[PDB]
């Protein structure tokens, strides 16, 4: 039974899960468009969207909280300087998912994760 | 809840220092004895000049438990240990004094003698 339970195990320990989604979020803020698996892409938007909301208010205490959840100097500077200012007026929904087929190796359903308003 | 092999101390001056439950009375396959239920005990430690002796089979009433008792409003009362009062053949206390508090569920028609002696009734 898993009535009203949230989250996905993804066949990893909770330490593996927590570390995988920091790398995947730090990659998303840097390249602005990444290709990943659909179950992993749906569990990522519960991680990287609370960071973009937190970046909207710039302060020393906020930038200290951001670094603790994404231990990357560049990613903390990527937020608080470009994002949060780009999405200052947007009420949520900062990233978009689009199904894009299946992997050749294992037939795993893939997806595209991208920030909504890339200036390209 | 008290079952067999449970050790529970005495709330009297009947000599017994520690007793152990060996049966729960009042029904077949009955499991637990709460506050106010009759049990069958054996004495495991006794006062040197008491009126009961070690290894004596007799009847007691449960007066105080760690599991506790529920009330109509939904509250609960719990104690820090299980205690019993040793009764004679006619379901009457053997010692004359009673130690510690007791509860109002014992304020029935057959155990009113042990409620009038307790220093506190909760």
């Amino acid at each position: 039974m898993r009535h009203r339970k949230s989250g996905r195990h993804l066949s990893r320990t909770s330490a593996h899960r927590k570390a995988m989604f920091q790398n995947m979020a730090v990659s998303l803020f840097e390249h602005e468009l990444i290709k990943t698996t659909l179950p992993k892409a749906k569990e990522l938007r519960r991680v990287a969207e609370p960071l973009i909301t937190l970046a909207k208010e710039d302060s020393v205490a906020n930038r200290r909280l951001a670094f603790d959840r994404t231990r990357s100097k560049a990613a903390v500077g990527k937020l608080f300087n470009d994002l949060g200012k780009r999405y200052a007026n947007r009420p949520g929904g900062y990233l978009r998912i689009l199904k894009c087929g299946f992997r050749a190796g294992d037939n795993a359903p893939m997806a595209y994760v991208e920030l909504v308003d890339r200036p390209v | 809840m008290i079952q067999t092999q449970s050790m529970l101390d005495v709330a009297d001056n009947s000599g017994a220092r520690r007793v152990m439950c060996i049966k729960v009375l009042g029904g077949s396959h009955r499991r637990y004895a709460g506050i106010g239920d009759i049990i069958k005990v054996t004495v495991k430690e006794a006062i040197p000049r008491g009126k009961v002796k070690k290894g004596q089979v007799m009847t007691a009433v449960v007066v105080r438990t760690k599991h506790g008792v529920r009330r109509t409003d939904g509250s609960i009362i719990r104690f820090d240990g299980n205690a019993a009062v040793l009764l004679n053949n006619k379901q009457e206390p053997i010692g004359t004094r009673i130690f510690g508090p007791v509860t109002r569920e014992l304020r029935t028609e057959k155990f009113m003698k042990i409620v009038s002696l307790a220093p506190e009734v909760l």
Binding site: - | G74, S75, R78, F79, D80, G100, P101, E120
Partner: protein, 114 residues
């Protein structure tokens, strides 16, 4: 749970002064002993406090006659007639379950002057 909260609101009509775990409170409990009714005082230190609105509760602990006893009151039941804080305790926790292993001078709680 939008109309459950409405059913519960019409029963929350008591004062219930503010208090926190570690305080020494006195609870006046309604007791019936036949046809006449009186009030029995229960004095002890609050060790737990459940904040759920109508289903709120709290637990106090006292040493009665050399035997410890704990009672969990329902905050909004008519049984709990009143409550008064006799002393404010200074603790760093929200549930003081460590007090059950301490007995005498080891179970003292500091005071909160302000």
């Amino acid at each position: 749970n939008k109309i459950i909260q409405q059913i519960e609101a019409e029963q929350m009509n008591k004062e219930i002064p503010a208090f926190a775990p570690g305080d020494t409170v006195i609870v006046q409990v309604k007791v019936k002993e036949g046809d006449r009714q009186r009030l029995q005082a229960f004095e002890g230190v609050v060790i737990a406090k459940r904040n759920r609105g109508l289903n709120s509760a709290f637990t106090v602990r006292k040493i009665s006659n050399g035997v410890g006893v704990e009672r969990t009151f329902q905050t909004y039941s008519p049984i709990v007639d009143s409550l008064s804080v006799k002393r404010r305790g200074d603790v760093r926790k929200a549930k003081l379950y460590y007090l059950r292993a301490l007995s005498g001078k080891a179970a003292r709680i500091k005071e909160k002057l302000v």
